[PDB]
């Protein structure tokens, strides 16, 4: 017989009841094969998130175009925007795509962003690079600032928390990539910074985790997803996501945390 998937649903419906809006989760147990998924393939945006898989996505270029990664990106004031802390620094010499690339996984930064995006032809190149293997649901539409909009009823921009998971278990411990390249991928989610409080807050200290955060700051949206390694353990890929339907409701990193120890600890 399999899971009472209503018993694994009613805690993720009570935290969403106190919260205003919507959580959507997917689980997978890469040793058992347990998942637990919650709204999983309702839409959600995907802010900053879209900044792991464009790590991907530059990584899977540098295969077929040696040193991609130690070549220098030296850029003017234009490719700057709020948000960007680590390429604002650099203004005056440049840095190369790994350093961009980093910068855009580990603090988020916009420009960063952009200027890989530029990189790949743009976000639709984004978006080929994840129907190429085999994400039918990822769109990533428009650049850094505008596709944090997160209007409610727009698809652009936006995921499923079942698709993120899927492919970032594909990138991250699938052979999707090179052996290299996805140990560099594992690597830059390892190092990431701006996920303390969000999944890294629900597992224990001593797990590796590796994750990618978005905040848009308006619709109760925000998410994270990582892989987990419990010690010994198969790992574990999850995604996160809210929305809520007021543009002044507020995101919580709690809601998230809460929601990823529900899923954590839902896995058969
Ligand atoms: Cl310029």
Same mark, same amino acid.
């Given at each position: 017989?399999?899971?009472?998937?209503?018993?694994?649903?009613?805690?993720?419906?009570?935290?969403?009841?106190?919260?205003?809006?919507?959580?959507?989760?997917?689980?997978?147990?890469?040793?058992?094969?347990? *998942?637990? /998924?919650? !709204? #999983?393939?309702?839409?959600?945006?995907?802010?900053?998130?879209?900044?792991?898989? %464009? =790590? @991907?996505?530059?990584?899977?270029?540098?295969?077929?175009?040696?040193?991609?990664?130690?070549?220098?990106?030296?850029?003017?004031?234009?490719?700057?925007?709020?948000?960007?802390?680590?390429?604002?620094?650099?203004?005056?010499?440049?840095?190369?795509?790994?350093?961009?690339?980093?910068?855009?996984?580990?603090?988020?930064?916009?420009?960063?962003?952009?200027?890989?995006?530029?990189?790949?032809?743009?976000?639709?190149?984004?978006?080929?690079?994840?129907?190429?293997?085999?994400?039918?649901?990822?769109?990533?539409?428009?650049?850094?600032?505008?596709?944090?909009?997160?209007?409610?009823?727009?698809?652009?921009? *936006?995921? /499923?928390? !079942? #698709?993120?998971?899927?492919?970032?278990?594909?990138?991250?411990?699938?052979?999707? %990539? =090179? @052996?290299?390249?996805?140990?560099?991928?594992?690597?830059?989610?390892?190092?990431?910074?701006?996920?303390?409080?969000?999944?890294?807050?629900?597992?224990?200290?001593?797990?590796?985790?590796?994750?990618?955060?978005?905040?848009?700051?308006?619709?109760?949206?925000?998410?994270?997803?990582?892989?987990?390694?419990?010690?010994?353990?198969?790992?574990?890929?999850?995604?996160?996501?809210?929305?809520?339907?007021?543009?002044?409701?507020?995101?919580?990193?709690?809601?998230?945390?809460?929601?990823?120890?529900?899923?954590?600890?839902?896995?058969?």
């Amino acid at each position: 017989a399999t899971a009472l998937t209503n018993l694994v649903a009613e805690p993720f419906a009570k935290l969403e009841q106190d919260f205003g809006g919507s959580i959507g989760v997917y689980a997978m147990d890469t040793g058992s094969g347990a *998942t637990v /998924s919650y !709204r #999983a393939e309702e839409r959600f945006p995907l802010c900053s998130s879209f900044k792991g898989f %464009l =790590a @991907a996505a530059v990584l899977a270029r540098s295969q077929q175009q040696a040193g991609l990664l130690d070549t220098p990106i030296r850029y003017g004031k234009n490719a700057l925007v709020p948000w960007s802390p680590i390429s604002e620094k650099y203004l005056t010499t440049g840095m190369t795509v790994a350093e961009l690339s980093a910068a855009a996984v580990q603090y988020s930064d916009n420009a960063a962003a952009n200027l890989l995006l530029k990189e790949l032809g743009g976000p639709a190149g984004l978006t080929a690079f994840m129907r190429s293997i085999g994400d039918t649901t990822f769109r990533l539409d428009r650049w850094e600032l505008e596709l944090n909009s997160a209007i409610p009823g727009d698809a652009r921009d *936006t995921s /499923s928390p !079942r #698709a993120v998971t899927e492919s970032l278990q594909k990138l991250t411990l699938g052979s999707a %990539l =090179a @052996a290299p390249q996805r140990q560099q991928f594992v690597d830059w989610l390892k190092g990431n910074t701006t996920g303390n409080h969000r999944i890294r807050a629900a597992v224990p200290a001593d797990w590796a985790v590796g994750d990618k955060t978005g905040t848009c700051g308006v619709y109760g949206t925000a998410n994270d997803y990582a892989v987990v390694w419990p010690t010994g353990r198969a790992p574990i890929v999850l995604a996160v996501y809210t929305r809520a339907p007021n543009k002044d409701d507020k995101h919580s990193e709690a809601v998230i945390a809460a929601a990823a120890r529900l899923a954590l600890e839902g896995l058969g």
